Amino acid sequence: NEKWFHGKLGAGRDGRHIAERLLTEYCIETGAPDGSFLVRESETFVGDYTLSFWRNGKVQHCRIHSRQDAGTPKFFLTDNLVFDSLYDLITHYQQVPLRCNEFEMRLSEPVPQTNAHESKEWYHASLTRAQAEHMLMRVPRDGAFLVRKRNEPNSYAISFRAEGKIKHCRVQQEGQTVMLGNSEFDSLVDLISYYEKHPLYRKMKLRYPINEEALEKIGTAEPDFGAFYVEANPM
């Protein structure tokens, strides 16, 4: 995939340190190899990206240059070898060593993001159980859900409608992975992509992402019906 592509990381020029914290937290916890990497917007060279990678418990940074030849983006670590995209650039350097400083090294494991859920239509950062129930009540359908942040640290909640009743599943951010009960996923984004395909609680799958727009394009101006922490289906 493009797991490795992190784009603009955090507060403007705090991206070098964020790139290091992310690579450090990942490489130490998972036990990833030297060569583990990710790409992001440059914090010094406008429009250029930066290749941050792990090597000997340190995190080294490389500049990815971005130029236009015939109004066509071209990317490169060195002008003797230019690519039509960052995928090509990355995939090349995964196979043949890149030279940074005065050491030669190939790229290895793509380091993903833990927070790609923050840009999803079903994710609500500030949302009370009662607030999400009120929203979930407004929707008549089943398999219509929303994930929200809980007050207790490194925790989220899947609030959903199942068999005409509103139940709640707990998820925990265990460092670089998430844990719904004894089951494990890379992230929420991947967890919900699984529970979109497979049932999460009983016969119900995660089909309809509810936000403010979804209440307009579906929901009822009237909450009250019938409507504890529920246990999901294993694995």
Author numbering: 547 to 773, 782 to 789
Structure paper excerpt:
Among families of proteins involved in signal transduction, phospholipase C (PLC) enzymes that generate second messengers from phosphatidylinositol 4,5-bisphosphate (PIP2) incorporate a number of different protein modules. PLCγ enzymes (PLCγ1 and PLCγ2), for example, contain eight domains, four of which are unique to this PLC family (Bunney and Katan, 2011; Suh et al., 2008). The PLCγ ‘specific array’ of domains (γSA), comprising a “split” PH (spPH) domain flanking two tandem SH2 domains and an SH3 domain, is inserted between the two halves (X and Y) of the TIM-barrel catalytic domain (Bunney and Katan, 2011). We demonstrate that among four domains present in the γSA, the cSH2 domain and its C-terminal linker provide a focus for most interdomain interactions both within the γSA and between the γSA and the PLC-core.
To analyze the structural and functional implications of Y783 phosphorylation and the potential for intramolecular binding to cSH2, we obtained the crystal structure of a construct incorporating nSH2-cSH2Y771F,Y775F (545–790) following phosphorylation on Y783. The structure of the tandem protein revealed an intramolecular interaction between the cSH2 canonical pY-peptide binding site and residues 781GFpYVEANPM790. Residues 774 to 780 are not visible in the electron density map suggesting that this part of the linker remains disordered. The structure shows that the cSH2 domain makes an essentially canonical binding interaction with the extended linker in which the pY783 side chain makes multiple interactions with three arginine (R675, 694, and 696) side chains in the conserved pY-binding pocket. The side chains of residues pY+1 (V784) and pY+3 (A786) are directed into shallower, hydrophobic pockets (formed by cSH2 residues F706, L726, L746, and Y747). The side chains of V784, A786, and P788 all make van der Waals contacts with the cSH2 domain, burying ∼620 Å2 of solvent accessible surface. Although the structure of the cSH2 domain is not affected upon pY783 binding, a further, more detailed comparison of the crystal structure of the phosphorylated nSH2-cSH2 protein with the nonphospho (apo) construct in the same crystal form shows general similarity with some subtle differences in angle and distance between the domains (not shown). However, the second binding phase is highly suppressed due to occupancy in cis of the canonical pY-binding site on the cSH2 by the pY783-linker region. The cSH2, in contrast, makes contacts with the PLC-core and recognizes an intramolecular pY motif rather than a receptor site. It also seems that a relatively small change in the tandem cSH2-nSH2—induced upon pY783 binding to cSH2—is allosterically relayed to the nSH2 domain reducing the affinity for FGFR1 but with no corresponding allosteric effect on PLC activity.
